[PDB]
């Protein structure tokens, strides 16, 4: 089954800097990767779907890119509200799977 690797586990950045989260799939999955955000004690929240399609209601600050086995979630000039755990998820092959997640630290 597809394994989603998210490394590093923790990401430290300075306020307003640009940050990129990584997600590698153990096999080619086209652009069937989606991103979620989960704040402390919160529920996951769809950020990006199909690797780069912006979701309605998500700051323009958020963007996604990649295809095949390498995917990147980026945030332009991070800010306190972005402090959270980020997960990737694939829908290319059954069963759907999740990455281990990356923590954003300011």
């Amino acid at each position: 089954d597809i394994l989603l690797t998210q490394s590093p586990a923790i990401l430290s950045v300075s306020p307003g800097e640009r940050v990129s989260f990584s997600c590698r799939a153990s096999q080619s999955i086209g652009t069937d990767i989606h991103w979620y955000q989960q704040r402390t004690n919160g529920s996951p929240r769809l950020l990006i779907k199909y690797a780069s399609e912006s979701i309605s209601g998500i700051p323009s600050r958020f963007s996604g890119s990649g295809s095949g086995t390498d995917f990147t979630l980026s945030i332009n000039s991070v800010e306190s509200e972005d402090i959270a755990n980020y997960y990737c998820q694939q829908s290319n092959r059954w069963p759907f799977t999740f990455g281990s997640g990356t923590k954003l630290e300011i």
């Binding site: 089954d1 829908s91 290319n92 092959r93 059954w94 069963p95």
Partner: protein, 103 residues
């Protein structure tokens, strides 16, 4: 009016229904099978079209028994449909050539 032209239409509507039911049934049959890729509706619908036309690219295909069963119905509907139009276009060409001659 003319039966052939009716069967053509009947088969096109029908084919469209089989394409739609096929997409839905495919996902239903394939989800639950490790490695299955025919598991979301939009691409399943594209899969059904490439199957009915027999184009086959090999980007998507069923890997379970029911999926393949569904696949067979879609292929047969596509082939039978596309072949029924041809039989329709022949009865037309033949009926019109008769005039241009002497019937």
């Amino acid at each position: 009016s003319a039966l052939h032209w009716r069967a053509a239409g009947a088969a096109t509507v029908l084919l469209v229904i089989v394409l739609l039911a096929g997409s839905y049934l495919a996902v239903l049959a394939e989800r639950g099978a490790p490695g299955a890729q025919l598991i979301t509706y939009p691409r399943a619908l594209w899969w059904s079209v490439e199957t009915a036309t027999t184009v086959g690219y090999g980007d998507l295909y069923p890997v379970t028994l029911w999926g393949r069963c569904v696949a067979v119905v879609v292929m047969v509907a596509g082939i039978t449909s596309f072949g029924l139009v041809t039989a329709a276009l022949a009865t037309w060409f033949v009926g019109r050539e008769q005039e241009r001659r002497g019937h």
